[PDB]
């Protein structure tokens, strides 16, 4: 019944993934041993969406864990929830990707993908009715960017009608740890625009801005950033795991969210968000849940939505709330902000409402925005790529893996074609 297969690639994808498995295990009331310990029948009713049932009433997550180095598998397997995963679903190399997209796609991961893909088959054949693939990765570095898009290509060719749904942490100029992220990302966006049905564009600069200017964390770690990502990953699948007043499958999102086939790059967000020293003074009610959810400060990509127009927004609410109040606020937003929505779509907001709010919240909203402002993320990556490529800087590391300058030229060509299609509707 609408099974999801989840796949983790590289350090970032395995870290946002290994936090995601701690969040949805808390929701479903599953112990770090894989045993069920929850309160409620509703936690158990759709446990099959993410977990295989196993002997002794143990639940094993339908995660495949992929890396070209052992050290992230060792860090996950030893971690807070590491024992929960199937030992056979840790698929790994020994020598890493070197932060090189061509090692991921052509050499080190091209060897390993035959050992990954045949595990994705064992999980997908164990499903009663698979709805899709849920892949966590980063576009900087080599493993997530180059092996993860190799794996998207292989699963897309094998499962053409299932939802391919990716959560994609991707570069920004003021928060970069690597020299060649513009190259790795440009070579990777060329695969996402053709193969995925949805891609949720996430940024460490925007995840630090939420931590500093909303949560008021003094020293936010990657563990705190991974917690913001995994709240929205749990958010968008909620309506196939819990009952609601308006149910929305990942496909019911895509049909409403994607006007033209390639405009599937989304900017996620979450509400409520507060400092732990001010949760005492807020009212969590739907109007305040809305005024934060549409705030340029709340969204997890550095693109300000005031530099474009929304095509579609989806607000997936959770909790006991009025349909009049939800339908009132999603009207009031797009009439009072009408200059920020495209006027050739007569209603730009999809709504969904689940009856079960996150553990310890009375209400939540997960926000998904498809906005012409996402061009500013692809434009800045292309402008960084261009400076390095106009002088062939670092290209012996990619061409030494058997790649061509023609593939760089074709990737940056397809990047500017994606930018031009979002700018066209602005």
């Amino acid at each position: 019944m609408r099974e999801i297969v989840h796949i983790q690639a590289g350090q970032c994808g395995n870290q946002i993934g290994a936090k995601f498995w701690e969040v949805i295990s808390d929701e479903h009331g599953i112990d770090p041993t894989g045993s069920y310990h929850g309160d409620s029948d509703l936690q158990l009713e759709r446990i099959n969406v993410y977990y295989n049932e196993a002997a002794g009433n143990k639940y094993v997550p339908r995660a495949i864990l992929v890396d070209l180095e052992p050290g992230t598998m060792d860090s996950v397997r030893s971690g807070p929830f590491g024992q929960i995963f199937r030992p056979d679903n840790f698929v790994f190399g020994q020598s890493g990707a070197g932060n090189n997209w061509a090692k991921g796609h052509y050499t080190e991961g091209a060897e390993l993908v035959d050992s990954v893909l045949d595990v994705v088959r064992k999980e997908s054949e164990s499903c009663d009715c698979l709805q899709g693939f849920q892949l966590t990765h980063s576009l900087g570095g080599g493993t997530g960017s180059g092996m993860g898009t190799l794996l998207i290509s292989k699963i897309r060719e094998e499962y053409p009608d299932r939802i391919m749904n990716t959560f994609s942490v991707m570069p920004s100029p003021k928060v970069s740890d690597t020299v060649v992220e513009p190259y790795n990302a440009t070579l990777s966006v060329h695969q996402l625009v053709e193969n995925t049905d949805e891609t949720y564009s996430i940024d460490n600069e925007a995840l630090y801005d939420i931590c500093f200017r909303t949560l008021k964390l003094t020293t936010p770690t990657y563990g705190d950033l991974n917690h913001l990502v995994s709240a929205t990953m749990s958010g968008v699948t909620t309506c196939l795991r819990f009952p609601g007043q308006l149910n929305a499958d990942l496909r019911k999102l895509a049909v409403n969210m994607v006007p033209f086939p390639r405009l599937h790059f989304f900017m996620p967000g979450f509400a409520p968000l507060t400092s732990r020293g001010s949760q005492q003074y807020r009212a969590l009610t739907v109007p305040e849940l809305t005024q934060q959810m549409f705030d340029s400060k709340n969204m997890m990509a550095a693109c300000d939505p005031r530099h474009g127009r929304y095509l579609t927004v989806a607000a997936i609410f959770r909790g006991r709330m009025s349909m009049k109040e939800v339908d009132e606020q999603m009207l009031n937003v797009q009439n009072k902000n009408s200059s920020y929505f495209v006027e050739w779509i007569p209603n730009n907001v999809k709504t969904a409402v689940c009856d079960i709010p996150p553990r310890g919240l009375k209400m939540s909203a997960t926000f998904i925005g498809n906005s012409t402002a996402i061009q500013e993320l692809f434009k800045r990556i292309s402008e960084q790529f261009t400076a390095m490529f106009r002088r062939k800087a670092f290209l012996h590391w990619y061409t030494g893996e058997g790649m061509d300058e023609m593939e760089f030229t074709e990737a940056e060509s397809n990047m500017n074609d994606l930018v031009s299609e979002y700018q066209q509707y602005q």
């Binding site: 019944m1 609408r2 029948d41 009713e45 009663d128 009715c129 709805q131 309506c239 196939l240 009952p243 609601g244 007043q245 308006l246 149910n247 499958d249 496909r251 019911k252 895509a254 049909v255 409403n256 969210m257 994607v258 006007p259 033209f260 086939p261 579609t312 709330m321 009025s322 349909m323 009049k324 109040e325 339908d327 009132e328 009207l331 006027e343 050739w344 779509i345 007569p346 209603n347 730009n348 907001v349 999809k350 709504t351």
Partner: protein, 430 residues
């Protein structure tokens, strides 16, 4: 005898069903396990088995499991026969073409097999009561697949249809206009009387009459069921003037395609208000001609009325009804067509409206459901085809419909057929 097969499709139809069957069980005194403690008044809606268990004459259909698995688990799990709660694996995704061509194509011959096993228990089947959303993928596409089959399989039988239709401002989907326009062939060709209802109109009725500031859907579905209990009351109970389900249509429908009446109910009222006014037959009759009580956001004063069915129930007497409608004929703001000098069909039933014990709505001695054919409803169509035009000029979501087996030309052929309905409702008003 006098059976009705009630078919509840998609989330909206199933959740209105979960309010309809909540009401019918109270009104006939059937427990939520289908038993009846201590006349054949239940027979229209329930088959009786030899154990003394009353099993409802209903089919619940959804292409995804979530909403019907909740019906299979809540207080009504023991009411329904387990194989007439019907689920697929795959959601219709608010896409008409998944409902009609690709996903619902697998479940249809299981749905019709249950409807046959219901119809073979009916000794004198009166009609079908079909409940759905116009905006849904299952709501539009599966209902339109089902109705095409029922209209060859049961061609003589009346098909009454209760539709939650898109609002002026309130909406839950981007593609609600596409699914609604594609549905207009279903209602024109394969339906006999189609009751459009609007979420935004019922929300405003809730705010003004029930004093509830922020309602859920459970508040709406207890008003949509109160109307069908009032339509079907003459089939179930004794009255001074009982109205048959074809007698109803012979007075409502002036021309074969002109079968989209408004509906309204009175008194919609809070229990706290209902002590401070007397709620006489003339008050509740006049309440039905207020724009404030219409359950579609259109103004009846921008139309002409063709025919009204004032379906009174409870402590109502034919004197008071004649005296009431003589005042409605006196008022010049309520305009009828020149060709209907009679105007009013009247029904009067002796059974008071049943309160659902958790409800927002008062105990009252009298109610009326007014079902009303009027030219004004064409504005609710002229709203929504202007939403369709903006998107279809860009082809704004068409690749999801074409990608699931639909012809692209069906969008032009559906907008064309809607303009021919919107022409007919303007053409008869002269």
């Amino acid at each position: 005898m006098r059976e009705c097969i009630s078919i509840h499709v998609g989330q909206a139809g199933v959740q209105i069903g979960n309010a309809c069957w909540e009401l019918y069980c109270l009104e006939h005194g059937i427990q939520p396990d289908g038993q009846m403690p201590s006349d054949d008044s239940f027979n229209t809606f329930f088959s009786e088995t030899g154990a003394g268990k009353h099993v409802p004459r209903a089919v619940f259909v959804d292409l995804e499991p979530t909403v019907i698995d909740e019906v299979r688990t809540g207080t009504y799990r023991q009411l329904f026969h387990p194989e007439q709660l019907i689920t697929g694996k795959e959601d219709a995704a608010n896409n008409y073409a998944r409902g009609h061509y690709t996903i619902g194509k697998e479940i249809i011959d299981l749905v019709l097999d249950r409807i046959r096993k219901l119809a073979d228990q009916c000794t004198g089947l009166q009609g079908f009561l079909v409940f759905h959303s116009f905006g849904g993928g299952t709501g539009s596409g599966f209902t339109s697949l089902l109705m095409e089959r029922l209209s060859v399989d049961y061609g003589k039988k009346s098909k009454l249809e209760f539709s939650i239709y898109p609002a002026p401002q309130v909406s839950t989907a981007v593609v609600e206009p596409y699914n609604s326009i594609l549905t207009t062939h279903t209602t024109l060709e394969h339906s006999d009387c189609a009751f459009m209802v609007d979420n935004e109109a019922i929300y405003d009725i809730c705010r003004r009459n029930l004093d509830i500031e922020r309602p859920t859907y459970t508040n709406l579905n207890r008003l949509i069921s109160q109307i069908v209990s009032s339509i079907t009351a003459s089939l179930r109970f004794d009255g001074a003037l009982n109205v048959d389900l074809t007698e109803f249509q012979t007075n409502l429908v002036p021309y074969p395609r002109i079968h989209f009446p408004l509906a309204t109910y009175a008194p919609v009222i809070s229990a706290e208000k209902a002590y401070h006014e007397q709620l006489s037959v003339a008050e509740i009759t006049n309440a039905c001609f207020e724009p404030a009580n219409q359950m579609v956001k259109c103004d009846p004063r921008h139309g002409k009325y063709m025919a009204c069915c004032l379906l009174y129930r409870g402590d109502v007497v034919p004197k008071d009804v004649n005296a009431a409608i003589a005042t409605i004929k006196t008022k010049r703001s309520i305009q009828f067509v020149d060709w209907c000098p009679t105007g009013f069909k009247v029904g009067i039933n002796y059974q008071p409206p049943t309160v659902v014990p958790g409800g927002d709505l008062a105990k009252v001695q009298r109610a009326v459901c007014m079902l009303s054919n009027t030219t004004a409803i064409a504005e609710a169509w002229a709203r929504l085809d202007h939403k369709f035009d903006l998107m279809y000029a860009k082809r704004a979501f068409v690749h999801w419909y074409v990608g699931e087996g639909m012809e692209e030309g069906e969008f032009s052929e559906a907008r064309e057929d809607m303009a021919a309905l919107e022409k007919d409702y303007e053409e008869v008003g002269v």
